[PDB]
Amino acid sequence: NEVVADNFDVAVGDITIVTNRTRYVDFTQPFIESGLVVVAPVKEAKSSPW
Amino acid sequence: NEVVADNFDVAVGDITIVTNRTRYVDFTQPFIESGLVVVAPVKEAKSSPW
Ligand SMILES: *[C@@H]1O[C@H](CO)[C@@H](O[C@@H]2O[C@H](CO)[C@@H](O)[C@H](O)[C@H]2NC(C)=O)[C@H](O)[C@H]1NC(C)=O
Numbered sequence: 001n002e003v004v005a006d007n008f009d010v011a012v013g014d015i016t017i018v019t020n021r022t023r024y025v026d027f028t029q030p031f032i033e034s035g036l037v038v039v040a041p042v043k044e045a046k047s048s049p050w
Numbered sequence: 051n052e053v054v055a056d057n058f059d060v061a062v063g064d065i066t067i068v069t070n071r072t073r074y075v076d077f078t079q080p081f082i083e084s085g086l087v088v089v090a091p092v093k094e095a096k097s098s099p100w
């Protein structure tokens with residue numbers, strides 16, 4: 001939202017292509033690929049005596 | 051592609067917002083929600099004395 005309001009002519013970094021982000025600025029092609037994954041602690045597979 | 055090359059001023063239909071399509075044209079707000087699902091045959095688990 002600063003790039004739209006002319007404060008920074010280009011934001012370089014971890015900026016991730018979302019749909020309303022592509023409306024207001026105009027990205028390049030992606031230079032790395034990312035997706036949301038879920039990390040969670042590893043645990044046992046067995047339940048109760050039930 | 052026939053809106054970028056200005057043969058049509060507006061494509062009204064079932065056009066789905068993808069992150070190239072938001073890049074080359076402008077969309078409205080999403081008036082209906084959609085997502086890719088996987089349809090498949092149901093489980094027909096039999097039950098008989100056979
Ligand atoms: C998608 O991104 C746009 C761009 O920032 C968001 O629109 C802005 O929303 C803030 C809310 O405080 C306000 O400054 C304005 O309504 C918008 N800024 C503009 C037009 O410069 C929009 O809210 C985002 N969508 C969602 C669902 O969060």
Ligand SMILES: *[C@@H]1O[C@H](CO)[C@@H](O[C@@H]2O[C@H](CO)[C@@H](O)[C@H](O)[C@H]2NC(C)=O)[C@H](O)[C@H]1NC(C)=O
Nearest residue numbers: 051052053054055068069070071072073074075
């Ligand atoms: C991304 O979307 C665009 C639009 O369909 C495609 O990129 C180019 O778009 C121009 C329109 O001005 C066409 O003339 C080019 O032929 C398109 N490039 C190619 C290689 O066909 C592009 O097809 C889309 N990206 C992907 C991966 O399909």
